[PDB]
């Protein structure tokens, strides 16, 4: 009904995060591109809080359970890999309901996830990753560089492609009965 359609929906843009995340990101060492986010961000704001986290989790998991991740240790795996995808989800919170869809909250929504899951990553990067620190860097340093930096460029490919579809395909965001 309503709901194996909402656990499709949830299914397939997880598995399609994954499946763009095999797509080569990096733009120098650690500092990447994740566009693989903008599945997991599309049906967040199409769907909502919930459905976001239950996707970022998903997505999370695959990457595990396939060997795709970059495992240090247990803790860091459930930070990187379940705690930050989740985090997306928080772009549910900016859903639209209502027609006309508004650009504002599509990229206030985006912004917000995005900053949230590499805040995750920062924190890891000072806490697991410190021992990869560029010659003369201390370790916050040295992840906010790296975790700010990709960040932003993964917002900004967050924000070209989710604006094309704002004003390709506005009804993605607004899910629909019927
Ligand atoms: C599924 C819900 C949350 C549980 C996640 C389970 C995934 C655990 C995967 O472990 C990792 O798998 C790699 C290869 O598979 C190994 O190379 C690596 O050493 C090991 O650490
Ligand atoms: C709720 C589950 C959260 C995700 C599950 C993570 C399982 C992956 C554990 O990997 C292993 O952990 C050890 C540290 O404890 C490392 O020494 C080892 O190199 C690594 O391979
Ligand atoms: C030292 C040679 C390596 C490159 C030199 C320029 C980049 C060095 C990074 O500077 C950073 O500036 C902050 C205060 O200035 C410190 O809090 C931080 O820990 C430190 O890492
Ligand atoms: C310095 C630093 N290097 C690597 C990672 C690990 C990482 C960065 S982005 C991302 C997306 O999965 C992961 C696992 C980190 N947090 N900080």
Excluded at 49 to 56: E, K, M
Excluded at 86 to 107: D, E, H, M, N, Y
Excluded at 133 to 153: P, R
Aim: charged residues 10%; contains cysteine.
């Amino acid at each position: 009904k309503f709901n194996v359609r909402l656990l499709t929906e949830i299914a397939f843009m997880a598995a399609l995060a994954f499946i763009i995340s095999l797509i080569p990101n990096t733009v120098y060492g650690w500092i990447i591109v994740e566009i693989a986010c903008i599945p997991i961000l599309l049906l967040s704001l199409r769907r909502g809080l919930t459905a976001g986290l239950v996707g970022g989790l998903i997505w999370g998991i695959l990457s595990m359970i396939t060997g795709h991740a970059y495992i240090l240790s247990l803790s860091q795996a459930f930070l990187e890999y379940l705690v930050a995808p989740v985090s997306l989800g928080i772009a549910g919170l900016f859903r639209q309901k209502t027609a006309p869809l508004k650009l504002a909250p599509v990229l206030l929504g985006t912004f917000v996830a995005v900053l949230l899951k590499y805040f995750f990553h920062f924190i890891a990067g000072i806490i697991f990753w410190s021992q990869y620190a560029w010659k003369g860097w201390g370790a916050v340093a040295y992840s906010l560089a790296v975790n700010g930096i990709s960040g932003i460029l993964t917002a900004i490919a967050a924000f070209v492609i989710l604006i094309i579809f704002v004003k390709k395909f506005p009804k993605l965001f607004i899910h629909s009965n019927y």
